[PDB]
Amino acid sequence: SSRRKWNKTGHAVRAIGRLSSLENVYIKADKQKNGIKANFKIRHNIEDGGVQLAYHYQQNTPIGDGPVLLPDNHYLSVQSKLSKDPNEKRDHMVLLEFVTAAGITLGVSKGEELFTGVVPILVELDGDVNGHKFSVSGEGEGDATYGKLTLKFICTTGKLPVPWPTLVTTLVLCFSRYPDHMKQHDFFKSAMPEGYIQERTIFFKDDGNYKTRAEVKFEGDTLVNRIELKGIDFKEDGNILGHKLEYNTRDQLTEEQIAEFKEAFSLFDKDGDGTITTKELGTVMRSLGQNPTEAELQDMINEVDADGDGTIDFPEFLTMMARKMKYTDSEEEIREAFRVFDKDGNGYISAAELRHVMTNLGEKLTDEEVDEMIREADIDGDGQVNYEEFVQMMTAK
Ligand SMILES: [Ca+2]
Ligand SMILES: [Ca+2]
Ligand SMILES: [Ca+2]
Ligand SMILES: [Ca+2]
Ligand code: NA
Ligand code: NA
Ligand code: NA
Ligand code: NA
Ligand code: NA
């Protein structure tokens, strides 16, 4: 009962953490190359705690001379699920994926006609990472109508020398659902059938990088992604070549974890109308130190604003807290979070610093309950909460 008094205030923090970060795929026109540029960050969980980041840079250039749609700035959201086929002797990856355009608020080309139904997909990649060659064959299909891909990947050369997740980004964004108001912004479909070239450089923080080059085009009725990948400067024992990444990753919101999110949701949603406004989000951040402009609040809300109505619908909110427990935060992000409470920087959250936050955030919290709270997390016994004591209060299971 003092336990969830953490889970509430902790999720409220990890929510402002999420709204402050850039988890999507940010697309902008590249008129220079009559094509587009994209950039996003990828979170790879490490099987024994922590996260590997992969900072992605992306060029798309069309293959033919056909006029193409060059979009205003928007983004995609991807939701990847990796599983195994249990009949499958070979090194493989079953990939389900949902891909949705958003980030233009409220107020078709020949190409789209080609994606109206279900389309066969074939993927062929030849890889060299630190000189370990491998090859990968995929088949599956894309209902563009829903933003759904289903694909199976086999490593044709035996054992893959890199964790499968690192390849997911590399192994067909022409299957994104664009909403009706955004159809004039789908370059990918516009470029079909002749195709686009998809070039990426992918930096794994504290490790090597991939250079990828991909022909994505129709061959008959089948959409085909052919890829060369070249990895350099990886560490023999680092997270990639040491296969130290989680494959599976946890997709299970216990009944009870959704309810933790609603208790949080309701800290922002002060009027209980089931949506969070710039006004309400401002109110909570101000009572927690930060002091952002109208501009920042709109851009934070627009990071998670599916319907593009300029507010966080209770559902839009759950989606984002689901993400933020699915993928591990970085040490930078946890520190930023700590420093919301550790309002002096000494590396310890005092009884008197928890009060300052709790009672600035608007809760009764008499000097009895405040201490019941501290004691909850205080493993080493010191009457204060240190950074590693904090990371325990901010994890699942
Ligand atoms: Ca509200
Ligand atoms: Ca919304
Ligand atoms: Ca302190
Ligand atoms: Ca302590
Ligand atoms: Na340009
Ligand atoms: Na073209
Ligand atoms: Na190669
Ligand atoms: Na690039
Ligand atoms: Na290459």
Residue numbers in the entry: 39 to 145, 159 to 222, 226 to 451
Reproduce text from the manuscript describing this model:
Here we constructed the prototype of a photo-switchable Ca2+ sensor based on GCaMP5G that can be switched with 405/488-nm light and describe its molecular mechanisms at the structural level, including the importance of the interaction of the core barrel structure of the fluorescent protein with the Ca2+ receptor moiety. In the present work we introduce the concept of rsGEIs.
We elucidated the structures of Ca2+-bound rsGCaMP1.1 at equilibrium and the 488-nm switched-off state to 2.15 and 2.90 Å, respectively. The chromophore shows a cis/trans isomerization between the ON and OFF state. In both states it lacks hydrogen bond interactions, except from the imidazolidone ring to R57 and E126 (all numbering GCaMP5G; 96 and 222, GFP numbering). This is in contrast to the OBF, which is primarily a rotation about the τ-bond of the methine bridge, preserving the i-position of the double bond.
